[PDB]
User: What shape does this take?
Amino acid sequence: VKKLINSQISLLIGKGLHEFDSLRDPEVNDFRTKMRQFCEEAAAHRQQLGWVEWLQYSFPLQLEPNRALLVNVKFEGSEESFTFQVSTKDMPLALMACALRKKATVFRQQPEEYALQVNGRHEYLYGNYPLCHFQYICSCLHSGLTPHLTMVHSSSILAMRDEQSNLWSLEQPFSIELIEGRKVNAMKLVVQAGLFHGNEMLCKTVSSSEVNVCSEPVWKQRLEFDISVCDLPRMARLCFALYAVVDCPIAWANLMLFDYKDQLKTGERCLYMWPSVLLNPAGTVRGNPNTESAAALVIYLPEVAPVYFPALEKILELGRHLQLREILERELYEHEKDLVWKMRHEVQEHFPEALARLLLVTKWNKHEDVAQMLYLLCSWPELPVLSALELLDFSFPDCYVGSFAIKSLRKLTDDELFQYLLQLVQVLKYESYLDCELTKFLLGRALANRKIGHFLFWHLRSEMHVPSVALRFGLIMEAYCRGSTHHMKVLMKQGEALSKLKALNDFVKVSSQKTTKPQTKEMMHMCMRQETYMEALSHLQSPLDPSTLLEEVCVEQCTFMDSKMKPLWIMYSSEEAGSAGNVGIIFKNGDDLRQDMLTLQMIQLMDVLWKQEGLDLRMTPYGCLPTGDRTGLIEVVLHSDTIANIQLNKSNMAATAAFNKDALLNWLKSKNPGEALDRAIEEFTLSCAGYCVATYVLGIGDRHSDNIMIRESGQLFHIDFGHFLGNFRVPFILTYDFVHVIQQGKTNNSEKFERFRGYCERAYTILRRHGLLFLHLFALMRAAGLPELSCSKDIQYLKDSLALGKTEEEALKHFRVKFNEALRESW
Ligand SMILES: CC(=O)Nc1nc(C)c(-c2cc(C)c3c(c2)CN([C@@H](C)C2CC2)C3=O)s1
Assistant: This one.
């Protein structure tokens, strides 16, 4: 059983646990033992949670960022149910009271003993919130559906819990010996070397002498750096770059000068290098695992003796010892930097949220100054979440700064954590050591919230094919599995389904090139009807949303789309869920989805920020999740079609039109007869404004009818981008056919069109006020290595699009010019 769990973890993470042992790495060994203990302690705490607390762990509340409605309620094991009329302002407890009173009269004879389950879902309604604060209830109101809920007793919840159990003296200049290499190229070879603290250099870079490409090259020369050994900061990074010249990049490699035990490193080191696109300080500090083919560089760190980095007590001991200040404190010159450092005590006392700027002006290549910074840091007041997100960036590489950022981030709600989880996982790629505060923070939150654990796992699992993170991410996942053996098995079931979908999709790719679609579709179904497929594809939690249950696969309704990669369309049904159980997922394999996944998350964030200000633009933040190498799932939006399909203006249809411009409007009329047409045009108008502003801010062009879809409700959404941040300055885009629907099919309708302009302006001004949040998240995403999110010019695009330099009046003026130009562009 102990053996079995190891084999199950190995299969789940895609890497045998035996491979960790074979490295013979003390840091790996210590990480595994320490974090296993940490995660098993979390498990012990979880298994003794009270039933309400377990609900909060397993089914965390999905809330939104008077009026009457019908609700159907039943009891766990019963066919019979009661339809109640309640108010939107009523609490769950009031609803549960009604249910128990009805049961008492039917059975002929305590609300606090119950929770309301959403039928056929792992989602619950509970707590002191009015019904309309829950996302499920709001979803039902907007779609006009009846909520269906099930009374679940505390003893049933506890049964779920139970079944799911488990130094300063060294003044000489820092130097190294470059011994030799082992490589392939066409010229002479040169090794550039630099000391870095994050992005900034600790001193000038030093080059090696030119040697012929011959060999297996040899140098055996000392490289001496312009910085004392006592002045090396704790997180000092020695970076190398091999290239050829008569420029031709070949390889690079980094390492930390101190090890994970705070000891200065000696002596000889073999650096297995990574291939280049000269210095790359943000690159990983672990060697290339492919030692067969990787070019190596052997070096010698001199035995200066055993020296450790000074402890915090010694650090603090050493350290213990105006209008224009404000005018610059909202890139700065030499005298301005000195002003800030001079008045660093005043920054702590009066301007604590300017810590970042203070950290950027401190001299990290002088230990007394670094010291002087850390004493202020250790009594620095906790900062808001927004400030802490900036501090996670690689520009702030110091470990005490990192620890301070995490300390300020502990007040993140689970909802905020979920929202920023993609970025936080990517920040792990900047980390220097395995055991770190970010990893412990994420694991802790993941074990305290099953939904966070679900998405943490998949973000990590989806990058196990990347050699530079496979070890780190594999270890984190192993640790998590030690924390929840039950959830490990739940995730294995998802993995087994995805394995079958990959095999099925490979068949479809081959088959689609050899026969007709009806024939490929029929053989797809025959493959799915195999017992191994029916079993593997049925009865699992959706990777897109663990609260969504994918029960019985509806083979007859499964198909594939015509796009190059032939993405699979998989439909499900659930008797217990009813119509809400009718859900679809798309499996797509062969394309890099990461950039589009980022775009969708950012649109999702925009939607939350708008709703927080009482602006609902009726967006469609459909689920999207990377699951493996160029593989991911997409949540199907049902009852929708492409603008292209509708604009074909097919005959013998309700949408058929006298002019092509009326095709969209006629389609909406057919789906929304009578008085319902007005709401659909509004839903269309609102969503159009949302996506117009979203694509403008994110710099998304290439917008055509094949990549835009419309729901029968009228809601417009996008299914391909991407292509963002001006990576084909993209203008604001207004399409004539959409303007036509907004104007109710009329040629002149300023009333409706200017309302639409108002929505766009309100949406735009709200995003400007959270401009810094976007900049900080995108900064952290530079860790991901996306082709179109590589440098400062990509970040600069957002500053320009949100006009953060300008005042609100100037920015709004500037936005109105872009809107008007887009209006003129429309025919
Ligand atoms: C009725 C109907 O077809 N409803 C639909 N709803 C959705 C949500 C559809 C959809 C389909 C596909 C093939 C994709 C997307 C969305 C988004 N997207 C990428 C940009 C993301 C993976 C990164 C796709 O590849 S199709």
User: Anything to note?
Assistant: The first strand starts at residue 68 and ends at 75. The pocket of E78 is lined by residues 561, 567, 586, 588, 593, 596-597, 622, 624, 632, 634, 636-637, 640, 719-720 (CB under 6 Å). The chain has 31 helices and 27 strands.
